[PDB]
Motif scaffolding. Structure first.
Motif, mmCIF file in Angstrom:
data_model
loop_
_atom_site.group_PDB
_atom_site.id
_atom_site.type_symbol
_atom_site.label_atom_id
_atom_site.label_comp_id
_atom_site.label_asym_id
_atom_site.label_seq_id
_atom_site.Cartn_x
_atom_site.Cartn_y
_atom_site.Cartn_z
ATOM 1 N N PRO A 108 -17.385 1.270 -1.425
ATOM 2 C CA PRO A 108 -16.346 0.798 -2.347
ATOM 3 C C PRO A 108 -15.501 1.918 -2.901
ATOM 4 C CG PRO A 108 -18.440 -0.241 -2.824
ATOM 5 C CD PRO A 108 -18.727 0.828 -1.828
ATOM 6 N N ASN A 111 -11.732 -8.233 15.186
ATOM 7 C CA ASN A 111 -12.034 -8.334 13.770
ATOM 8 C C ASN A 111 -13.528 -8.510 13.553
ATOM 9 O OD1 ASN A 111 -12.160 -10.815 14.919
ATOM 10 N ND2 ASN A 111 -10.552 -11.733 13.660
ATOM 11 N N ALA A 112 -13.979 -8.093 12.379
ATOM 12 C CA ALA A 112 -15.393 -8.137 12.058
ATOM 13 C C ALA A 112 -15.532 -8.615 10.619
ATOM 14 C CB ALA A 112 -16.037 -6.763 12.296
ATOM 15 N N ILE A 113 -16.755 -8.937 10.219
ATOM 16 C CA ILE A 113 -17.042 -9.452 8.889
ATOM 17 C C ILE A 113 -17.468 -8.273 8.032
ATOM 18 C CG2 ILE A 113 -18.199 -11.221 7.589
ATOM 19 C CD1 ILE A 113 -16.421 -12.127 9.877
ATOM 20 N N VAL A 114 -16.517 -7.674 7.343
ATOM 21 C CA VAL A 114 -16.795 -6.477 6.566
ATOM 22 C C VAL A 114 -17.335 -6.863 5.199
ATOM 23 C CG1 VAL A 114 -14.967 -5.301 7.806
ATOM 24 C CG2 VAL A 114 -14.501 -6.306 5.575
ATOM 25 N N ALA A 115 -18.057 -5.935 4.589
ATOM 26 C CA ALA A 115 -18.543 -6.080 3.229
ATOM 27 C C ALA A 115 -18.272 -4.790 2.480
ATOM 28 C CB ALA A 115 -20.033 -6.402 3.196
ATOM 29 N N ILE A 116 -17.780 -4.912 1.257
ATOM 30 C CA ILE A 116 -17.462 -3.762 0.426
ATOM 31 C C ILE A 116 -18.592 -3.613 -0.575
ATOM 32 C CG2 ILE A 116 -15.749 -2.637 -0.992
ATOM 33 C CD1 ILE A 116 -14.985 -3.463 1.927
ATOM 34 N N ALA A 117 -19.535 -2.733 -0.281
ATOM 35 C CA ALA A 117 -20.675 -2.527 -1.161
ATOM 36 C C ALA A 117 -21.263 -1.162 -0.848
ATOM 37 C CB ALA A 117 -21.716 -3.635 -0.995
ATOM 38 N N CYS A 118 -22.082 -0.666 -1.762
ATOM 39 C CA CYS A 118 -22.794 0.591 -1.575
ATOM 40 C C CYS A 118 -24.255 0.230 -1.368
ATOM 41 C CB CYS A 118 -22.590 1.522 -2.761
ATOM 42 S SG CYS A 118 -22.870 0.758 -4.372
ATOM 43 N N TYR A 119 -24.626 -0.055 -0.122
ATOM 44 C CA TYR A 119 -25.992 -0.492 0.120
ATOM 45 C C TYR A 119 -26.894 0.727 0.244
ATOM 46 C CZ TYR A 119 -29.513 -3.859 1.560
ATOM 47 O OH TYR A 119 -30.621 -4.669 1.616
ATOM 48 N N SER A 120 -26.712 1.658 -0.688
ATOM 49 C CA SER A 120 -27.681 2.666 -1.093
ATOM 50 C C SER A 120 -27.936 3.780 -0.093
ATOM 51 C CB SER A 120 -29.018 2.000 -1.402
ATOM 52 O OG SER A 120 -29.689 1.665 -0.200
ATOM 53 N N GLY A 121 -27.463 3.671 1.139
ATOM 54 C CA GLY A 121 -27.828 4.779 1.991
ATOM 55 C C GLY A 121 -26.780 5.603 2.699
ATOM 56 N N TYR A 122 -25.765 4.978 3.297
ATOM 57 C CA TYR A 122 -25.037 5.760 4.289
ATOM 58 C C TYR A 122 -23.545 5.471 4.390
ATOM 59 C CZ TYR A 122 -29.820 6.768 5.590
ATOM 60 O OH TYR A 122 -31.138 7.155 5.566
ATOM 61 N N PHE A 131 -23.706 -2.786 -6.094
ATOM 62 C CA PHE A 131 -22.467 -2.620 -6.839
ATOM 63 C C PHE A 131 -21.307 -2.658 -5.859
ATOM 64 C CE2 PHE A 131 -19.058 -1.020 -9.170
ATOM 65 C CZ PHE A 131 -18.578 0.120 -8.571
ATOM 66 N N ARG A 160 -0.270 6.398 3.549
ATOM 67 C CA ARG A 160 -1.388 5.661 4.200
ATOM 68 C C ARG A 160 -0.830 4.856 5.379
ATOM 69 N NH1 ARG A 160 -4.640 8.778 1.659
ATOM 70 N NH2 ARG A 160 -3.265 8.318 -0.110
ATOM 71 N N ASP A 189 -20.970 -7.660 9.394
ATOM 72 C CA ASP A 189 -20.896 -6.812 10.573
ATOM 73 C C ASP A 189 -20.977 -5.334 10.233
ATOM 74 O OD1 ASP A 189 -20.604 -9.045 12.213
ATOM 75 O OD2 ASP A 189 -18.428 -9.062 11.930
ATOM 76 N N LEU A 190 -20.312 -4.911 9.162
ATOM 77 C CA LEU A 190 -20.419 -3.533 8.716
ATOM 78 C C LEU A 190 -20.004 -3.447 7.257
ATOM 79 C CD1 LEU A 190 -17.486 -1.386 10.057
ATOM 80 C CD2 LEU A 190 -17.477 -3.863 10.063
ATOM 81 N N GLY A 247 -15.545 -10.459 3.386
ATOM 82 C CA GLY A 247 -14.816 -11.317 4.287
ATOM 83 C C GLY A 247 -14.479 -10.654 5.608
ATOM 84 N N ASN A 274 0.840 -1.187 0.000
ATOM 85 C CA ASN A 274 0.000 0.000 0.000
ATOM 86 C C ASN A 274 0.878 1.241 0.000
ATOM 87 O OD1 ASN A 274 0.959 -0.153 2.569
ATOM 88 N ND2 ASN A 274 -1.041 -0.260 3.574
ATOM 89 N N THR A 284 -12.187 -8.917 8.673
ATOM 90 C CA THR A 284 -11.125 -7.921 8.706
ATOM 91 C C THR A 284 -11.021 -7.353 10.113
ATOM 92 O OG1 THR A 284 -11.522 -7.358 6.386
ATOM 93 C CG2 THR A 284 -10.238 -5.805 7.684
ATOM 94 N N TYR A 285 -9.796 -7.022 10.515
ATOM 95 C CA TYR A 285 -9.534 -6.468 11.832
ATOM 96 C C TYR A 285 -9.782 -4.964 11.864
ATOM 97 C CZ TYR A 285 -7.407 -6.594 16.435
ATOM 98 O OH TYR A 285 -7.177 -6.540 17.788
#
Ligand SMILES: [Zn+2]
Ligand SMILES: [Zn+2]
Lengths: 262, 49, 45, 171, 147, 66, 20, 391, 115, 56, 135, 56
Positions: free
Chosen positions: E34, D160-171, H214, D104, E29-30, E108, D100, E110-111
């Motif tokens: 993108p 750690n948590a279960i993240v998701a990379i998406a634009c779920y339309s609101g916030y 998306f 950053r 979880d959150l 998936g 990276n 992530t920390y």
RNA sequence: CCCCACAAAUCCCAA
């Protein structure tokens, strides 16, 4: 008759079945009702008479508010708020007490089976903490050694899952339809190949392959849904399914009668 | 806490110059961490073993 | 008007990168003469 | 690491061998070689910041010692014990800092100190003005070999948590 | 914040009943934007996510090791043989309707770590409070209920 | 600290199995993988916790308060 | 093609203990 | 506060869950992200103040920036990407969705436009329904380098009577731009209808994205095998050319360009060659990139990304710089104690060869750190300086 | 904190029913219905099953904000046919269908009683 | 350099030309050396222009 | 109240995907007319189209400020619908080429078609019309 | 500078902000705690008598 | 009440 159902298999904790002659909205609503507002019972208010353990108090309270409880007869009693009584009469409450003593020289554990029913059970199977394992030990609460004491008084009241996760009986659900994407509701991202870059669903073998080049059946409609329901253990699974159906229909009937009243 | 013991600091000035040791140096290789620095009005001054 | 012009000319004061001298030092020099050159070049046609 | 230019086995070789490291592992698992005990017999040597202008360094112990993933003279005198050790305390936490942009990494190095978790164990006894302790700390699934030595895995920072990379339309 | 400077805050909170959900019934979880990926250009975050997923599957805890031979391809092969999409993309459902999501979503574990700035410590308002002695102006400081 | 209860993501009760999980890695010398698989955690949400949990009460309690 | 994605401390401990 | 904006009036709708709450569109004029920003409020007391605050500092009559005569407003990242997604010839939509999203527009005429197609099923183009949110009586023509009035590439934009005819919605058309749609509607109809337009567009596009969804991921970055092999060989040939130039220099025969010193010409030539390598490699990586990619969609759609970003992530970074002059000889006759003395090869003197995808190498990592530190310190000083000048 | 509270999730409103009526002035026989203390779990189902009918013209529902467990629903149909009758018939269809589903489910499960 | 120049047929065309760039400043002389445009000269340092050409 | 404005049979030259998975541009030449040229955008996924195929076209101004489109009315819909590709749109530009050959440009939501030929210099329209294609 | 051209004021607040696509431009979301604290004077009229009475 | 530390906040870009 209508929405036929076929069972795949079942166990003490989970059920798999097929659902047919249903519209997507109904199935999703079923999922949400099982996951959201199935009524049950959980510990809500706790009285810390005396703590000595290294662990914090409200910490212990939060941990207590999560152990599942036997809730087969939950329909029998009523909500505390809807009850004409004050301060949680027996018709809308159950009282639990815990007694942990740091007596030994090795660390002593505290399991869910340690706490015991106190108030009148009035002859309904309620409030027994589930012991899933073969060892009769519920989930661990805290530990003590030779010098600590816990005197706890707990009150369990009605509650529902959607306002807070304590009253969630489902904790696990699954949902599938058109494993072969024949409805083409979504495509597949792929760097090189659509087929290889994706695995095959275990539900594939039931529906046929896409006939390898048949013209797109635009007028086809979704059906034949795949359900997996696994309960926490607070209550049998067929019970949760039937109760979900019942509460959904009660909601619909309520809105209909409100319409009539208006 | 560990990242507060092995800490350094030099006096240069109040505001600061822009051609003097703030920017990293070749000699710093393998002695001072090339990323663990604060930012703003002290960047490149405080540095970490 | 004057305040508006001052703010307009002051907005890009931040979004700037930093050989012929240019950039913030050149702006300071030209706006703040400072009878020094640092680049006395002149074009001839 | 000190590297002897001469070698009866051939070209060139760093002096230490497998026997010494085996003895080191044995000493450690005993719960009598020390780092000092490595120093005495001439196997590693301290280098001040001044000397490097008279020493040639080999990054890897095999980079040029003998005769797609990524991109990879004959007069070496010392080899780096390990490159990942050029970091500091905080940057060591960053997983794959190579992959990276550097500013950053600097942002994260500064920011991580502002994270809660645990700071000691006696805190139930140790009074203080300010204190933060979270319920259920978790050692991150991703990690580097370093922070084991930082006791970090013993005293994690977040969970750690279960993240998701998406634009779920609101916030 | 993540371990890669990708700081941020919570906007709102949903619950499971309407949060997007996967085939296996896992719910995230959150969820983050993108668009935060390319501009900041932090790539290692995604590798961390993928490796963490495969580590959790195998149970064997993962590795970071800044300068080593571990590359993405081995991760993809191992994850694929565990029975998921090689690059981690996943079929995803819309909680409100249950309809298939047209695209796919990288998804998936992530920390993260909690930061020091809780909103309650930083909210502050004032209306006709104490005045400063020397200058009759409103006093300073949120703690002293300043302006 | 005490192992969490009622897995965050899914909700399945966790912690009752924790002490069982320990001895599986002590006298059975299995790997955590097969340990959990026999323990019965298909979804990894129930599984991340068992992997990454860090006991601290073990360190706390072995003080001698009073 | 794992290329060592994982490392275990207790397993290495026990393996070298039985090695000793 | 920097300019006339960041100072706008606002109406208030009081909300639970203590925090502030504002529209995404106004994000840019305040220059405020949500990374943990803090924001101030002032409440007027008398009547005069309220009136003049309503009539001067309200957002709707603040759309166009007087400082640059183009609207400082404009829809932003999420809805921008979404509207680009929707405004494609290759999309469609069914009754079930269109009914709801028509009901989403507040001032919807309560009339459903006829389906663009009927044969097996009524459907609609994204353009078709999106035209509803557009107020009637608007016209716009773009014709950007394609647009043969039967645009094959579908570039450009044409609107008749508030109804889309053809084109793909883009930041170049709907974002902050000189000939932007928002500019046209503000100047034409009235400087408050634009607010309703913002609301309608945001709402409908958000709703459609919700059910579309998306995302992106690692697989977005990874490129084709033989193509990245071509990238590698291009880098190699650039290195060969650099080495050849160096060999020519070392034999004392050179161009010796007019004015500047021999060393200066050498440095200029090598820098030029390296930049040529980098941008050629980036071009190759881009032209490889599949059109079903998400990040490519995002970058061409506007809001976030660049050619440089994808180039750096996929193929190569390029040598780090320290005030133009590439990294100098800190130690005597070398830039790092892992190199032989007196070398001018790009790797020896700090050219980043690898790409972020594979990951750097210790030396390249150090050079990247140098560049980042340079940027940080220079900005951290210029901020205070230029603030003084501004005051 | 002095805000509208969490009880808006399901605890019904005080001094008012579960619904309110209002006729639109923009289309003939158009009626909008306000529902509160619910969300998608009911609105999606109702709108879909209502759209199943072909005597109805247009139906749609939306939630104004995730903060407030309230949502609106708009219906208009052909002349003569009252929308309220349509929706009540729709509810009847729903209750019948789900009841059949239930009864079938218990029949199945008792059939699938192990051994 | 190139300069947009009115075409003899009535248009504009980018046409090459030769210019001189220096590294020092002076005006009281370069204005006089023959073969040089006495009008199109220009300098970055505006103060000298003010001292020579005038405040406008 | 509903009459055809122009009918003809066309032969398609070839099909163009245009990196679109569902829609493809089409073009054809008239059989009876030696000068009427046609181009059009077609949803191939919704409807197969092959090169070297005969096509039939119909203008169909109406069907025998219009109100809201009626649901398909599963009862009788005795309309000019004995085709397959029935669809609607709007014209936006007219062009006179070769001083004789008129060109009309029709927009279809986002789809486009261009028609040529010079005998109906007046029969063809106005802004909107329908389109009927069989087999 | 610290007192004349710039000074502390009253009727102000500051918190953290978040986005919302359900709220149009000219509006802004405010937490009810502020509405409790922040205030504004009105003068009694024969028009607002009822509303102000109820509000009191 | 001042003085010192200590942190946030301005985390780009355009095509
Ligand atoms: Zn009671
Ligand atoms: Zn779980």
């Amino acid at each position: 008759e209508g929405p036929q159902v076929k069972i795949r298999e079942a166990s003490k904790d989970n059920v798999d079945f097929i659902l047919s002659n249903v519209d997507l909205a109904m199935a999703n609503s079923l999922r949400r009702v099982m996951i959201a507002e199935i009524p049950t019972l959980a510990i809500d208010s706790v009285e810390v008479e005396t703590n000595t353990t290294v662990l914090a108090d409200e910490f212990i309270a939060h941990r207590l508010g999560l152990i599942p409880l036997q809730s087969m007869d939950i329909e029998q009693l009523e909500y505390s708020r809807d009850c004409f009584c004050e301060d949680h009469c027996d018709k809308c409450s159950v009282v639990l007490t815990l007694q942990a003593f740091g007596e030994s020289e090795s660390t002593t554990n505290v399991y869910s089976k340690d706490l015991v029913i106190v108030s009148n059970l009035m002859g309904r199977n309620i409030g027994h903490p589930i012991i899933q394992d073969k060892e009769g030990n519920g989930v661990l609460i805290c530990k003590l050694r030779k010098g600590q004491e816990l005197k706890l008084t707990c009150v369990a009241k009605k509650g529902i899952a959607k306002e807070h996760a304590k009253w969630g009986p489902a904790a696990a659900i699954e949902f599938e339809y058109d494993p072969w994407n024949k409805l083409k509701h979504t495509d597949y991202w792929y760097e090189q190949d659509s087929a290889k870059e994706w695995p095959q669903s275990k539900n594939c073998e039931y529906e046929d392959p896409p006939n390898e080049g048949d013209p797109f059946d635009y007028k086809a409609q979704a059906d034949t849904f795949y359900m997996n329901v696994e309960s926490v253990g607070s209550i049998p699974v067929d019970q949760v399914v039937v109760r979900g159906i019942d509460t959904l229909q009660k909601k619909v009937a309520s809105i209909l009668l409100a319409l009539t009243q208006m | 806490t560990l990242s507060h013991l092995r800490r350094t600091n030099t006096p240069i000035g109040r505001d600061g110059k822009l051609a003097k040791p703030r920017q990293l140096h070749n000699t710093h290789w393998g002695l001072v961490c090339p990323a663990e620095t604060p930012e703003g009005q002290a960047c490149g001054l405080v540095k970490n073993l | 008007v004057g305040v508006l012009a001052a703010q307009s000319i002051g907005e890009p004061a931040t979004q700037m990168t930093l050989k012929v001298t240019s950039g913030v030092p050149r702006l300071k020099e030209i706006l703040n003469v400072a009878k020094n050159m640092k680049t006395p070049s002149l074009t001839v046609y | 690491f000190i590297v002897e230019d001469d070698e009866s086995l051939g070209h060139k070789e760093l002096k230490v061998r497998k026997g010494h490291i085996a003895k080191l592992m044995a000493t450690e698992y005993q719960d009598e070689y020390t780092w000092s005990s490595l120093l005495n017999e001439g196997l590693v040597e301290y280098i001040d910041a001044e000397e490097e202008e008279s020493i040639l360094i080999a990054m890897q112990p095999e980079d040029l010692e003998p005769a797609a993933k990524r991109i990879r003279a004959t007069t070496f005198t010392h080899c780096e014990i390990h490159p990942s050790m050029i970091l500091g305390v905080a940057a060591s936490i960053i997983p794959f800092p190579d992959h990276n942009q550097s500013p950053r990494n600097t942002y994260q190095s500064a920011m991580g100190k502002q994270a809660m978790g645990v700071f000691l164990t006696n805190y139930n006894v140790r009074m203080d003005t300010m204190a933060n302790i979270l319920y259920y700390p978790q050692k991150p699934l991703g990690t580097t070999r370093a922070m084991e030595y930082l006791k970090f895995r013993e005293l994690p920072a977040g969970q750690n948590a279960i993240v998701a990379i998406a634009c779920y339309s609101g916030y | 914040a993540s371990r890669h400077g990708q700081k941020g805050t919570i906007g709102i909170t949903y619950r499971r009943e309407d949060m997007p959900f996967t085939a296996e019934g896992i719910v995230p979880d959150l969820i983050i934007n993108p668009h935060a990926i390319p501009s900041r250009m932090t790539v290692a975050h995604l590798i961390e996510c993928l490796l963490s997923k495969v580590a959790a599957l195998s149970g064997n805890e993962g590795d970071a090791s800044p300068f080593t031979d571990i590359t993405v391809e081995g991760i993809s092969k191992l994850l694929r043989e565990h029975g998921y999409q090689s690059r981690g993309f996943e079929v995803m459902y819309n909680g409100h309707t249950g309809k298939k999501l047209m695209a796919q979503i990288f998804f998936g574990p992530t920390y993260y770590q909690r930061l020091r700035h809780m909103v309650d410590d930083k909210i502050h308002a004032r209306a006709r409070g104490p005045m400063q002695v020397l200058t009759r102006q409103p006093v300073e400081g949120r703690s002293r209920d300043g302006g | 600290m005490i192992v969490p209860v009622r897995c965050f993501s899914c909700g399945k009760v966790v912690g009752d199995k924790w002490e069982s999980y320990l001895n599986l890695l002590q006298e059975d010398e299995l790997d955590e993988g097969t340990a959990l698989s026999r323990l019965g955690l298909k979804r990894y949400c129930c599984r991340r916790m068992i992997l990454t949990h860090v006991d601290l009460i073990e360190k706390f309690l072995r003080y001698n308060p009073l | 093609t794992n290329a060592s994605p994982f490392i275990k401390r207790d397993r290495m401990r026990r393996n070298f203990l039985r090695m000793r | 506060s920097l300019h006339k904006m960041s100072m706008m009036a606002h109406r208030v709708k009081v909300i639970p869950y203590s925090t502030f709450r504002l529209n995404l569109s106004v994000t840019s004029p305040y220059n405020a992200d949500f990374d943990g920003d803090e924001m101030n409020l002032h409440v007027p007391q008398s009547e005069e103040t309220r009136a003049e605050l309503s009539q001067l500092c309200a957002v709707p009559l603040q759309i166009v920036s007087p400082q640059s005569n183009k609207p400082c407003m404009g829809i932003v990242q999420d809805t921008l990407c979404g509207i680009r997604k929707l405004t494609l010839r290759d999309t469609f939509i069914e009754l079930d969705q269109v009914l709801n999203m028509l009901y989403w527009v507040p001032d919807w005429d309560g009339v459903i436009p006829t389906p663009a197609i009927i044969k097996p099923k009524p459907l609609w183009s994204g353009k078709q329904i999106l035209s509803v949110a557009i107020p009637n009586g608007i016209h716009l023509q773009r014709f950007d380098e394609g647009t043969t009035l039967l645009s094959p590439k579908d570039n450009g934009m044409l609107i008749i009577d508030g109804q889309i005819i053809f084109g793909v919605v883009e930041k170049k058309t709907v974002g902050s731009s000189n000939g932007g749609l928002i500019h046209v509607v503000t100047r034409e109809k009235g400087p408050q209808v634009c607010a309703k337009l913002f609301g309608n567009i945001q709402k409908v596009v958000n709703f459609w994205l919700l059910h579309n969804g998306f995302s992106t991921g690692i697989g977005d970055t990874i490129a084709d095998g033989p193509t990245m092999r071509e990238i590698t060989e291009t880098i190699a040939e650039a290195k060969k050319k650099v080495l050849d130039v160096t060999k020519e220099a070392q034999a004392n025969l050179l161009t010796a360009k007019h004015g500047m010193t021999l060393r200066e010409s050498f440095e200029d030539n090598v820098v030029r060659f390296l930049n040529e390598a980098r941008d050629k490699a980036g071009r190759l990586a881009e032209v490889n990139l599949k059109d079903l990619n998400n990040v490519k969609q995002m970058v061409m759609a506007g809001s976030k990304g660049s050619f440089i970003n994808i180039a750096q992530m996929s193929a190569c970074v390029g040598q780090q710089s320290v005030e133009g002059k590439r990294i100098a000889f800190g130690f005597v006759d070398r830039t790092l104690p892992h190199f032989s003395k007196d070398d001018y090869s790009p790797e020896s003197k700090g050219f980043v060869e690898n790409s972020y995808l594979r990951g750097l190498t210790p030396q390249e990592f150090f050079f990247h750190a140098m560049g980042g530190r340079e940027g940080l310190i220079d900005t951290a000083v210029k901020t205070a300086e230029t603030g003084y000048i501004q005051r | 904190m002095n805000a509208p509270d969490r009880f808006e999730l399901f605890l019904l409103g005080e001094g008012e029913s579960k619904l309110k009526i209002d006729p639109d002035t923009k289309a003939p026989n158009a009626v909008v219905i306000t529902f509160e203390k619910e969300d998608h779990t009911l609105g999606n189902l109702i709108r879909a099953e209502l759209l199943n009918d072909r005597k109805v013209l247009f139906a749609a529902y939306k939630v104004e904000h995730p903060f407030f467990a309230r949502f609106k629903l708009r219906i208009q149909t052909t002349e003569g046919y009252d929308p309220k009758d349509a929706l009540k018939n729709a509810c009847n269809s729903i209750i019948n269908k789900l009841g059949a589903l239930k009864t079938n489910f218990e029949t199945e499960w008792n059939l699938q009683t192990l051994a | 350099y190139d300069r947009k120049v009115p075409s003899p047929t009535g248009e504009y065309v980018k046409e090459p030309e030769w210019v001189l760039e220096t590294d020092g400043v002076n005006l009281s002389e370069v204005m006089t050396v023959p073969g040089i445009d006495p009008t199109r000269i220009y300098t970055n340092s505006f103060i000298d222009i003010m001292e020579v050409l005038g405040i406008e | 109240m509903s009459n055809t404005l122009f009918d003809d049979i066309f032969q398609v030259s070839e099909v163009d995907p245009g990196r679109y998975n569902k829609v493809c541009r089409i073009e054809a030449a008239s059989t009876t007319q030696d000068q009427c040229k046609l181009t059009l955008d077609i949803n191939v996924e919704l409807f197969p189209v092959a090169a070297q195929d005969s096509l039939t076209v119909t203008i169909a101004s109406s069907l025998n400020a219009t109100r809201s489109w009626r649901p398909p009315q599963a009862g009788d819909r005795s309309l000019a619908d004995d085709y397959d590709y029935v669809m609607y749109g709007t014209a936006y530009k007219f062009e006179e080429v070769s001083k004789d050959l008129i060109a009309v440009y029709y927009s279809f939501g986002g789809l486009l078609m261009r028609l040529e030929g010079n005998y109906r210099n007046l029969n063809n329209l106005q802004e909107n019309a329908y389109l009927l294609i069989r087999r | 500078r610290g007192n004349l051209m710039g000074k502390r004021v009253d009727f102000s607040a500051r918190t953290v902000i978040s986005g919302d696509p359900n709220l149009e431009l000219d509006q802004v979301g405010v937490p009810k705690s502020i509405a409790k604290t922040l205030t504004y004077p009105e003068v009694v009229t024969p028009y607002n008598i009822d509303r102000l009475t109820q509000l009191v």
